[PDB]
Coordinates of C-alpha atoms and ligand atoms in Angstrom, one line a residue:
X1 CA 117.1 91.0 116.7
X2 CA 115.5 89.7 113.5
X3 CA 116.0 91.8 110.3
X4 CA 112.9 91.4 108.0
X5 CA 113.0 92.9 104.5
X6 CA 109.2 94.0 103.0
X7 CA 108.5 95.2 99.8
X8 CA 105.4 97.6 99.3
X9 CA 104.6 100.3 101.4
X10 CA 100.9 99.8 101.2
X11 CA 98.3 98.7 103.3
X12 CA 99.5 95.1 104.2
X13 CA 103.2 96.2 103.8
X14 CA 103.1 99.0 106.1
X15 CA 101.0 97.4 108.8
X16 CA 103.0 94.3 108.7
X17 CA 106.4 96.4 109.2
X18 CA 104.5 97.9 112.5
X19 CA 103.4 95.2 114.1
X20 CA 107.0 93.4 113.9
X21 CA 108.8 96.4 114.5
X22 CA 107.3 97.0 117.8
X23 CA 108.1 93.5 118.3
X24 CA 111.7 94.6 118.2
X25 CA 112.3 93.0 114.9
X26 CA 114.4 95.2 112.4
X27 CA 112.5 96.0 109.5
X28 CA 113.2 97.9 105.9
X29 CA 110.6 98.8 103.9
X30 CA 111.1 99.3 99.9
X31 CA 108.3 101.5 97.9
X32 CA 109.0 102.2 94.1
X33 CA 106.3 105.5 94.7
X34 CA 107.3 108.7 96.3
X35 CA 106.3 109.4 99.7
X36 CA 102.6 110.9 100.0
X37 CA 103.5 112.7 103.2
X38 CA 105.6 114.9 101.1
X39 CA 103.5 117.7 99.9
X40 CA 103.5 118.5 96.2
X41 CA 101.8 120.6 93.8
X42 CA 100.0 117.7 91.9
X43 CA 96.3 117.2 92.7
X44 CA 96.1 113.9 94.2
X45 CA 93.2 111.9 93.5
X46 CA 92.0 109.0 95.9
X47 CA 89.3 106.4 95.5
X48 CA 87.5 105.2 99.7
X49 CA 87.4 102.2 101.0
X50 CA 84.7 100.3 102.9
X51 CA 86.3 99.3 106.5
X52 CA 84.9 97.0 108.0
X53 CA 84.9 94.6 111.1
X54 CA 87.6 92.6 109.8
X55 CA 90.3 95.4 108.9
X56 CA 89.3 97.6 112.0
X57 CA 89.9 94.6 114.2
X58 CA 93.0 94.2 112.6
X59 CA 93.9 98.4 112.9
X60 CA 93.0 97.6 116.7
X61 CA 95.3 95.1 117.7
X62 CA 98.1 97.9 116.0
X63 CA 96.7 101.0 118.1
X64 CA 95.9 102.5 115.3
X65 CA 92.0 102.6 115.1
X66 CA 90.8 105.7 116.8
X67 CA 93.0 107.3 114.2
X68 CA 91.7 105.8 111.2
X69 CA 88.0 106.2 112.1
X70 CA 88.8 109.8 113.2
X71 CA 88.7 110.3 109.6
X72 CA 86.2 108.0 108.2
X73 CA 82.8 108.1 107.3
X74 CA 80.4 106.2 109.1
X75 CA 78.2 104.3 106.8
X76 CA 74.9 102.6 108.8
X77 CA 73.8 100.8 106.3
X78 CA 73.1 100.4 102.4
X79 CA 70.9 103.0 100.2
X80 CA 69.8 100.9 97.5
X81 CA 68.6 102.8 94.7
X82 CA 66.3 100.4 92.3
X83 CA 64.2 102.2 89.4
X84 CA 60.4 102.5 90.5
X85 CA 61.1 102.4 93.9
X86 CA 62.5 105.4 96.3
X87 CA 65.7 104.7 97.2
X88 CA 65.5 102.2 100.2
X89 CA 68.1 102.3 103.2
X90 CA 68.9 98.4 104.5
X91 CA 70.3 99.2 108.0
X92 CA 74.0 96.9 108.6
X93 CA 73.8 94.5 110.4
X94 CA 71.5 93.9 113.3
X95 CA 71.9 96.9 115.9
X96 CA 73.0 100.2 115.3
X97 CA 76.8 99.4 116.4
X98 CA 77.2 97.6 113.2
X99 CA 78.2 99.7 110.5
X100 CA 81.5 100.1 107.8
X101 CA 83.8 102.7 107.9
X102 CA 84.2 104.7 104.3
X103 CA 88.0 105.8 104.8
X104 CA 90.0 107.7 101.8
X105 CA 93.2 105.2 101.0
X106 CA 95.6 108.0 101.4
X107 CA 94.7 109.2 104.6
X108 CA 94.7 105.6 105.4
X109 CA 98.0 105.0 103.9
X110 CA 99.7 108.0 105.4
X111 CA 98.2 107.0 108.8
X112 CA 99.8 103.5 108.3
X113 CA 103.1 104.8 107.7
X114 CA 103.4 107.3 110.3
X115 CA 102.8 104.1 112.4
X116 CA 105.2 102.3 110.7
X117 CA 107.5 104.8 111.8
X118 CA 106.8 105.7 114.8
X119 CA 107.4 101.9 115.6
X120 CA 111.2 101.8 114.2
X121 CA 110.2 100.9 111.1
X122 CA 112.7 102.6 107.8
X123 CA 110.7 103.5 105.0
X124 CA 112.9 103.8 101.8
X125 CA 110.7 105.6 98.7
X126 CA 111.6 106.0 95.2
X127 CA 112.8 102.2 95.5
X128 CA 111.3 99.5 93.2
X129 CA 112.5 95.7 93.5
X130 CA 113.7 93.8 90.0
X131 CA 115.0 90.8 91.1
X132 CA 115.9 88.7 93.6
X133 CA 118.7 85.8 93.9
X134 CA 117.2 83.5 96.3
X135 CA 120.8 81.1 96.2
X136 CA 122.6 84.7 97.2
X137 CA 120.3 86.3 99.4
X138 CA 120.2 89.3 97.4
X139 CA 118.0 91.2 95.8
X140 CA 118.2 94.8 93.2
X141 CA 116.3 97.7 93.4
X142 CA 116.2 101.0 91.4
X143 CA 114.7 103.9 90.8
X144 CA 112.8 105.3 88.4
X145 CA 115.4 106.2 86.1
X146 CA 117.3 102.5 86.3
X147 CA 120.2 103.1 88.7
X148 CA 120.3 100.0 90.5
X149 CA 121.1 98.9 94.2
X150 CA 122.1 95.7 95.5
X151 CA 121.2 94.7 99.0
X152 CA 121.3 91.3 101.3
X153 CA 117.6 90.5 102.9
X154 CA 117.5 87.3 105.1
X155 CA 113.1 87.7 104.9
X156 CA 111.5 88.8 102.4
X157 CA 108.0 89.6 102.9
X158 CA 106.1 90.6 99.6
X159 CA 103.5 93.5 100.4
X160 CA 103.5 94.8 96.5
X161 CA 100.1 94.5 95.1
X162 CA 98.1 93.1 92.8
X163 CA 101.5 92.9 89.9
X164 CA 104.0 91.6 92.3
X165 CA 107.7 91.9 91.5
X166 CA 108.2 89.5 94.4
X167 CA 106.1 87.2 93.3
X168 CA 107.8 87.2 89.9
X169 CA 110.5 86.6 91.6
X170 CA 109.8 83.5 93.1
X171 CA 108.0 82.1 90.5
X172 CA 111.3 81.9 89.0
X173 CA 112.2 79.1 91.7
X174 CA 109.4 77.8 92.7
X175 CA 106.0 77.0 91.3
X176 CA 103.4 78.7 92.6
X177 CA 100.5 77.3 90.6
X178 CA 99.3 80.1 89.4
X179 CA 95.9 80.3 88.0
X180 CA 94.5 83.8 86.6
X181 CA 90.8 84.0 86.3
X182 CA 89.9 87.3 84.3
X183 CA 87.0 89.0 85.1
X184 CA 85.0 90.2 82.2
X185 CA 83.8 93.2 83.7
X186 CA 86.4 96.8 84.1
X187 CA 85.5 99.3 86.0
X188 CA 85.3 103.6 86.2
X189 CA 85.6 105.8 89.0
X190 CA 83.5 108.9 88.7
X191 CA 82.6 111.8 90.5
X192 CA 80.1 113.9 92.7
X193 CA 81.2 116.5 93.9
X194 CA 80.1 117.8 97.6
X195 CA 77.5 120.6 95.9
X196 CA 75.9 117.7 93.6
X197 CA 75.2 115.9 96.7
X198 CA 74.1 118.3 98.8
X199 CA 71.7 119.6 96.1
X200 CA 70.5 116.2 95.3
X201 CA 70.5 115.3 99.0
X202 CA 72.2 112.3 98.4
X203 CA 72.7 110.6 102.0
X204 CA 76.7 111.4 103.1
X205 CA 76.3 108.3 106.1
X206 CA 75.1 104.9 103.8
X207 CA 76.9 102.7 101.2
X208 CA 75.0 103.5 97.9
X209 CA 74.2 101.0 95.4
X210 CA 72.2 101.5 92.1
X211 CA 72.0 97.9 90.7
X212 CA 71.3 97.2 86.9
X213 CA 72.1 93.0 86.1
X214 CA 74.7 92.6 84.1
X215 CA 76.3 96.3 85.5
X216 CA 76.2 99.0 88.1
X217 CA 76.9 101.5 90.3
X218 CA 78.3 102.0 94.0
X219 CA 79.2 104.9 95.6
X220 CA 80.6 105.9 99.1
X221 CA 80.9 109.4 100.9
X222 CA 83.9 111.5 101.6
X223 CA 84.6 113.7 104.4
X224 CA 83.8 116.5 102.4
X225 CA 80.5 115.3 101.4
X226 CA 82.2 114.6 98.0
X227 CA 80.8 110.9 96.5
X228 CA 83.5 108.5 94.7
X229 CA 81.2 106.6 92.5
X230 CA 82.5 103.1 90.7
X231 CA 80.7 101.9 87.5
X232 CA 81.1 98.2 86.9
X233 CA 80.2 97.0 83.0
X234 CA 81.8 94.7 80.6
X235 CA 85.1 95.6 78.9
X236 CA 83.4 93.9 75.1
X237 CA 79.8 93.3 74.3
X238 CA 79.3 89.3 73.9
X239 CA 78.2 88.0 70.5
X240 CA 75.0 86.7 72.0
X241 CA 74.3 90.0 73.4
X242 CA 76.0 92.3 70.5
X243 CA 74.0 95.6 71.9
X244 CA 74.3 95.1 75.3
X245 CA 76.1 98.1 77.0
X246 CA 79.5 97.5 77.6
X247 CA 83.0 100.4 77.8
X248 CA 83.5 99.6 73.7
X249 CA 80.6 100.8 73.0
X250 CA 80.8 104.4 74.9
X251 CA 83.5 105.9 72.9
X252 CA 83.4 108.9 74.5
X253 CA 81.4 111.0 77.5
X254 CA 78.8 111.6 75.2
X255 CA 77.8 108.4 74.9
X256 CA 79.0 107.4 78.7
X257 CA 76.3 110.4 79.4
X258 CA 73.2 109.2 77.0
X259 CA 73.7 105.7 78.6
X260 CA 73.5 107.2 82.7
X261 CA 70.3 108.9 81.2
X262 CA 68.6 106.2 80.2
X263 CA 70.0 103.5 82.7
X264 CA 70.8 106.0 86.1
X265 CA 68.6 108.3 85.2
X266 CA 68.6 109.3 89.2
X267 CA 72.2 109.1 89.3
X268 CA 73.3 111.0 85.9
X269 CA 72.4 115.0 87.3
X270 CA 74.8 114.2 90.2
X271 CA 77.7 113.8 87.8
X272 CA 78.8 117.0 86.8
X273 CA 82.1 115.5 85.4
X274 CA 80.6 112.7 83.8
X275 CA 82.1 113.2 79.9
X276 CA 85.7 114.4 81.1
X277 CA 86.1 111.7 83.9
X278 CA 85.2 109.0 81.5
X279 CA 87.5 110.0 78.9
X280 CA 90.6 111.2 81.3
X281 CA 90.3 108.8 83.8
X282 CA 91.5 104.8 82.4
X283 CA 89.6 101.9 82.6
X284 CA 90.4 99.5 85.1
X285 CA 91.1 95.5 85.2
X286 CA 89.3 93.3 87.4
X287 CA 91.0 89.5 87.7
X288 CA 91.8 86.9 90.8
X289 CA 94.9 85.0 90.7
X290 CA 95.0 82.4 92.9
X291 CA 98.8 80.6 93.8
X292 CA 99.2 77.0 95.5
X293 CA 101.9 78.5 97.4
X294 CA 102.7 81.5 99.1
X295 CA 105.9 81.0 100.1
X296 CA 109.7 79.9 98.9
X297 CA 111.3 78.2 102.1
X298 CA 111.8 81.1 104.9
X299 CA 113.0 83.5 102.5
X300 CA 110.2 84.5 101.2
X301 CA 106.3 84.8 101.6
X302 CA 103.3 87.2 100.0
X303 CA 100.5 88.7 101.5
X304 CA 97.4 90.5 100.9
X305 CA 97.1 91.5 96.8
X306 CA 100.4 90.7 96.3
X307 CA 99.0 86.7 97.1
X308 CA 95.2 86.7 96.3
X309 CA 94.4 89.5 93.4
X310 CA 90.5 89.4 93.8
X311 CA 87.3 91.1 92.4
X312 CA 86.3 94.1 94.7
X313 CA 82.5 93.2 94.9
X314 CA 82.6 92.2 98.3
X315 CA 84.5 95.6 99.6
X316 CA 87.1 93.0 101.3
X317 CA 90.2 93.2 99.9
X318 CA 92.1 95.8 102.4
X319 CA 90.2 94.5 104.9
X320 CA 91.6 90.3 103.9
X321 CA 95.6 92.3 103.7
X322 CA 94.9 93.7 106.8
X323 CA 94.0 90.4 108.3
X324 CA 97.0 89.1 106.7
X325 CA 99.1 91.6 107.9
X326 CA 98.4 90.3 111.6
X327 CA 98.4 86.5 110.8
X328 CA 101.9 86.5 109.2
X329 CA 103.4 88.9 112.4
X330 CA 101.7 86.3 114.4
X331 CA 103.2 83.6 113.1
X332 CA 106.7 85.4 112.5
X333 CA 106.7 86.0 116.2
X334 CA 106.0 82.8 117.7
X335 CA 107.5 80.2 115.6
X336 CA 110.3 77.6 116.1
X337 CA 111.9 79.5 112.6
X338 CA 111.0 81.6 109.6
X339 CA 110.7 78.4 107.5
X340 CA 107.7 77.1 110.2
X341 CA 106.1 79.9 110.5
X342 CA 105.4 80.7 106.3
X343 CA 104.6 77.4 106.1
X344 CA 102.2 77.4 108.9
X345 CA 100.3 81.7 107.7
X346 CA 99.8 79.8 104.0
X347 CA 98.3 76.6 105.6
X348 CA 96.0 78.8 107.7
X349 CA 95.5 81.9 105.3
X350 CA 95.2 80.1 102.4
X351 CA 91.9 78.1 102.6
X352 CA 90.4 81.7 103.6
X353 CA 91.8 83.5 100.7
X354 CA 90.1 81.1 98.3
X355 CA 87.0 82.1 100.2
X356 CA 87.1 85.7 100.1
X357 CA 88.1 85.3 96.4
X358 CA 85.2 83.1 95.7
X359 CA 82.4 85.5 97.8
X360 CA 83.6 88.2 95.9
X361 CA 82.9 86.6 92.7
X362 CA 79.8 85.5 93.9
X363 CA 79.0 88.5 95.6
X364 CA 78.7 90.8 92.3
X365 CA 75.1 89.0 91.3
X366 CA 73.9 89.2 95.1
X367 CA 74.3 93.3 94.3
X368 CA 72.9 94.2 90.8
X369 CA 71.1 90.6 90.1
X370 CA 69.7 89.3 93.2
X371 CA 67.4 91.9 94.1
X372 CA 64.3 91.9 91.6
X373 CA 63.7 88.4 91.8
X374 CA 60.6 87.3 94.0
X375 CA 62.6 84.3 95.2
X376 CA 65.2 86.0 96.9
X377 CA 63.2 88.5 98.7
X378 CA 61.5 85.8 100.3
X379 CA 64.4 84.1 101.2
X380 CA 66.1 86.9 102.6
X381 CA 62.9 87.5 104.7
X382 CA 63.4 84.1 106.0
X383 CA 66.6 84.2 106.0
X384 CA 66.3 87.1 108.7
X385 CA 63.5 85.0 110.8
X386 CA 65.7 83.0 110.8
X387 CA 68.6 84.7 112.4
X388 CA 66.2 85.9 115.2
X389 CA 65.3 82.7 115.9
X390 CA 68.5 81.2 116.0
X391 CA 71.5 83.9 116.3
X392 CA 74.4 81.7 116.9
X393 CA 73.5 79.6 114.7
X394 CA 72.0 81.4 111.4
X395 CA 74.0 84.4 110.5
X396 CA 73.7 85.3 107.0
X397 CA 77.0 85.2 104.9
X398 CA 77.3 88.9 104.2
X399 CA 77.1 89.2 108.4
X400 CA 79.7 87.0 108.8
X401 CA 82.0 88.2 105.7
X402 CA 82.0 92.3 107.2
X403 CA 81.2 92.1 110.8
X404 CA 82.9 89.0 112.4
X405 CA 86.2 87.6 112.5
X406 CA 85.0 84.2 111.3
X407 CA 87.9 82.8 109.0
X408 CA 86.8 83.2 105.3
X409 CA 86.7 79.0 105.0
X410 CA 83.7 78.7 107.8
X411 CA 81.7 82.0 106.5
X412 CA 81.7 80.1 103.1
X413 CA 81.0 77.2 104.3
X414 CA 78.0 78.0 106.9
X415 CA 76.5 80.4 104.2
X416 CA 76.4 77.1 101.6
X417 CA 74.3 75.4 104.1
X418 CA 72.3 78.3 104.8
X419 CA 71.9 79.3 101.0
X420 CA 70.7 75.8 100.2
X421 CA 68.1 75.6 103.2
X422 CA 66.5 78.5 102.4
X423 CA 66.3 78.0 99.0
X424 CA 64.8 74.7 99.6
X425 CA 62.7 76.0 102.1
X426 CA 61.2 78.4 99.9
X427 CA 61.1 76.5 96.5
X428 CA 57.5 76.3 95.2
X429 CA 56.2 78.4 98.0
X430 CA 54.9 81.7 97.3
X431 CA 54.6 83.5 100.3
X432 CA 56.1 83.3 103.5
X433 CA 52.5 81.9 105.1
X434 CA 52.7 78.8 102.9
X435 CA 56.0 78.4 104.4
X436 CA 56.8 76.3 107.9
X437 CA 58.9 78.3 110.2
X438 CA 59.7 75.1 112.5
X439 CA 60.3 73.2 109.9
X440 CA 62.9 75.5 108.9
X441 CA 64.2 76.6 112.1
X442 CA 64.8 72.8 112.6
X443 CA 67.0 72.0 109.9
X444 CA 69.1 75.2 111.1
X445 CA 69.7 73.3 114.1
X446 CA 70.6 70.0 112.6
X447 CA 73.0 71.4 109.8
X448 CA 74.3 74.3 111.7
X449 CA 76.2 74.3 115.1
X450 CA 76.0 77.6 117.1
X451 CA 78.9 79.8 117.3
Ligands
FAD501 C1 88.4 99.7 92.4 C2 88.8 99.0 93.7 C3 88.0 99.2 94.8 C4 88.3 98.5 96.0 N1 87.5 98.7 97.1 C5 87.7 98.1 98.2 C6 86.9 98.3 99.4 O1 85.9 99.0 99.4 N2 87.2 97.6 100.5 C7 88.3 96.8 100.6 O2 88.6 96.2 101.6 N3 89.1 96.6 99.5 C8 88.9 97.2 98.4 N4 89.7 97.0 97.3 C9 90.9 96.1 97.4 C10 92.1 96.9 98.0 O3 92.2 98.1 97.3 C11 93.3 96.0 97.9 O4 93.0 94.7 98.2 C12 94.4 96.5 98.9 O5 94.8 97.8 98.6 C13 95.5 95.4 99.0 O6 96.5 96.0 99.9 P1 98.0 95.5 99.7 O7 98.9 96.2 100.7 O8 98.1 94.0 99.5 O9 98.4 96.2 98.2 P2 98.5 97.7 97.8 O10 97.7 98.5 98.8 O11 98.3 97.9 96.3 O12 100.1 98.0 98.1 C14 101.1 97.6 97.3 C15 102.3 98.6 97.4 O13 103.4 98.0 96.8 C16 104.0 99.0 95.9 N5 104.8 98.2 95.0 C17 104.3 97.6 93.9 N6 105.2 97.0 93.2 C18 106.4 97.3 93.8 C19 107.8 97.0 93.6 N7 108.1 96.2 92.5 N8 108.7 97.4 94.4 C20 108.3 98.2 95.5 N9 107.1 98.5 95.8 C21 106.2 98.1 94.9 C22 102.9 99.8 95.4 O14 103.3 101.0 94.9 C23 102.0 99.9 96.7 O15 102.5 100.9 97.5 C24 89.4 97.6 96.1 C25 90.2 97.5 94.9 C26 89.9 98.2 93.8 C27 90.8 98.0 92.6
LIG502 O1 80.6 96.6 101.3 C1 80.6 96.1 100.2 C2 79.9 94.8 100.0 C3 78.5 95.0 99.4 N1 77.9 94.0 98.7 N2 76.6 94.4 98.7 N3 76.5 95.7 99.2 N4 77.8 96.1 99.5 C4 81.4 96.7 99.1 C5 81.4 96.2 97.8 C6 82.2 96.8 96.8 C7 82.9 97.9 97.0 C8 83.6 98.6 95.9 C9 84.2 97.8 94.9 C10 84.9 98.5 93.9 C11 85.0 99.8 93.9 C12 84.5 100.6 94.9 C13 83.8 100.0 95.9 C14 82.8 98.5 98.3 C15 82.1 97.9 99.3
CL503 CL1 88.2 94.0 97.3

């Protein structure tokens, strides 16, 4: 039996370690946190995530699907809250089978690890990795108080996030060509709580965006009718724009709360908690980090953050580590040796993490930018006659992104080509009468082959 070591009980860790250990492989899993299965007194506190095709595919092929969405909310489509205007709902995709899945992380991650588990899987908590000696095979762990423990691992598969000890680790013998792009936008994570909603009869099953340019807001439902609500701003205001809003300048929740008035102003009453979570809760860090390689030999590989830290603006990242998850057990179990089959999961996954890591970039102006201007309304009107026209052949790029299982490279590439012909299409035409719809469906046949 092969022995694979994985580091990261998360959501690429833990569904990796099921899908080989079902396989028959023999598989340890490290995590430096406690186990959430074990029931404290601490009141947990867990940010959803917006499932989608990709990542429920993915939960599929491990039998572990009709358990996940057991406990997810089902989101048909996006509530798009734009001042002047009632808030509009844009249904997903184009029937009413196509929705994402809002699922809270820890019942996702205690879901995964009972899988894990009940697979043959060992699951060792309280367990963080330091180093590795790649010449040795070896590796140290410890706990949280610095006793260390030595162990042998002939694979190492790194599943631990976005600050990787595994990749530090092999960046110590290899180069992985690292390039860090920070992102100069943090983040918050408020709250509405299930009575604000209610009252406010905010809708529990949509995604709900409240765009404003250069920030905004996104929430998505609990079980419990509760709202986790993500605010996305600059960290410092820019000396071009020295009063634009930005987390310097609300130095406390008062401030946080005279800014949602005057810039949320539908959004503000539903936050109850607005001044104590602003000031309790930390500002996050947004960056992508993109590596050359992935992998040292057939000792070791990464997957899902632990690979490609990316912006969450496209709602992709668990879903991409999912899909990870499944390549590299894929490849694991059908190749000549551990060597082939790395090389061969970074050859194929690689291309498509650049892509995901570029959409989502480009994906945070499509949500608070791109939807006042007259240009793009047009073009997403054509851009919708256009996939009735031709379905295999014109899907647009967000489509393809959620509810396919395109690879991330062709999704890119296919929504370049359909970006630049409706924005050619529509350029110095005002309204979509002035426009020629065979002229257009034309060039969708010539540029873009059907699927
Ligand atoms: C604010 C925010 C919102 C997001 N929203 C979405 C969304 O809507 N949809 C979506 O698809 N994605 C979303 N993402 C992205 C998603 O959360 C991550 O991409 C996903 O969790 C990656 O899974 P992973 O298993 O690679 O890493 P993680 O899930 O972070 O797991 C890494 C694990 O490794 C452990 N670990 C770390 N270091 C060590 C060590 N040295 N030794 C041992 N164990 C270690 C950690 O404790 C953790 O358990 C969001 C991200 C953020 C920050
Ligand atoms: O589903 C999406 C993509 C989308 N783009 N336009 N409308 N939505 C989506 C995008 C972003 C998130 C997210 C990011 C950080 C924190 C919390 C949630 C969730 C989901
Ligand atoms: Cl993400």
């Amino acid at each position: 039996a092969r022995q694979v070591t994985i580091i990261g009980a998360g959501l690429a860790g833990t569904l990796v370690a099921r899908l080989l250990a079902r396989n028959g492989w023999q598989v340890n899993l490290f995590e430096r946190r406690p186990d959430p299965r074990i029931e404290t007194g601490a009141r947990g506190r867990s940010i959803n995530l917006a499932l989608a095709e990709r990542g429920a595919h993915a939960l599929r092929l491990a039998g572990l699907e009709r358990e996940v969405l057991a406990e997810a909310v089902m989101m048909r489509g996006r509530m798009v809250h734009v001042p002047g205007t009632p808030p509009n709902l844009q249904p997903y995709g184009r029937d009413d089978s196509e929705v994402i899945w809002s699922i809270n992380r820890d019942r996702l991650n205690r879901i995964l690890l009972d899988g894990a588990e009940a697979a043959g899987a060992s699951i060792h908590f309280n367990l963080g990795l330091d180093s590795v000696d790649f010449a040795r095979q070896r590796l140290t762990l410890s706990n949280v108080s610095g006793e260390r423990l030595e162990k042998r691992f002939h694979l190492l598969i790194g599943a631990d996030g976005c600050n990787s000890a595994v990749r530090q680790a092999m960046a110590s013998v290899v180069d992985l060509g690292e390039h860090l792009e920070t992102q100069p936008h943090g983040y918050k994570e408020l709250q509405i709580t299930p009575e604000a909603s209610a009252q406010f009869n905010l809708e529990p099953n949509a995604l709900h965006i409240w765009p404003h340019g250069d920030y905004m807001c996104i929430a998505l439902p609990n079980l419990d009718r509760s709202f986790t609500v993500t605010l996305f701003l600059h960290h410092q205001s820019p000396a071009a724009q020295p009063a634009s809003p930005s987390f310097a300048q609300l130095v406390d929740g008062h401030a946080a709360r005279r800014f949602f008035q005057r810039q949320f102003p539908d959004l503000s009453p539903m936050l109850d908690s607005l001044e104590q979570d602003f000031e309790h809760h930390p500002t996050g860090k947004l960056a992508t980090l993109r590596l050359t390689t992935w992998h040292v030999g057939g000792q070791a590989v990464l997957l899902g953050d632990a690979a490609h830290p990316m912006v969450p603006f496209h709602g992709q990242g668990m879903n991409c580590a999912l899909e990870d998850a499944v390549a590299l057990a894929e490849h694991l179990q059908s190749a000549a040796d551990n060597a082939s089959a790395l090389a061969a999961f970074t050859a194929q996954r690689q291309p498509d993490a650049l892509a995901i890591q570029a959409m989502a970039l480009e994906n945070y102006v499509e949500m608070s930018s791109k939807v006042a201007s007259p240009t793009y309304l047009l073009e997403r009107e054509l851009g919708q006659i256009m996939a009735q026209r031709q379905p295999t052949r014109f899907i647009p790029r967000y489509s393809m992104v959620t509810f396919s299982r395109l690879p991330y490279a062709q999704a890119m590439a296919r929504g370049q080509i359909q970006e630049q012909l409706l924005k050619f299409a529509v350029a110095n035409h005002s309204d979509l009468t002035s426009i020629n719809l065979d002229a257009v469906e034309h060039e969708v046949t010539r540029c873009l082959p059907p699927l």
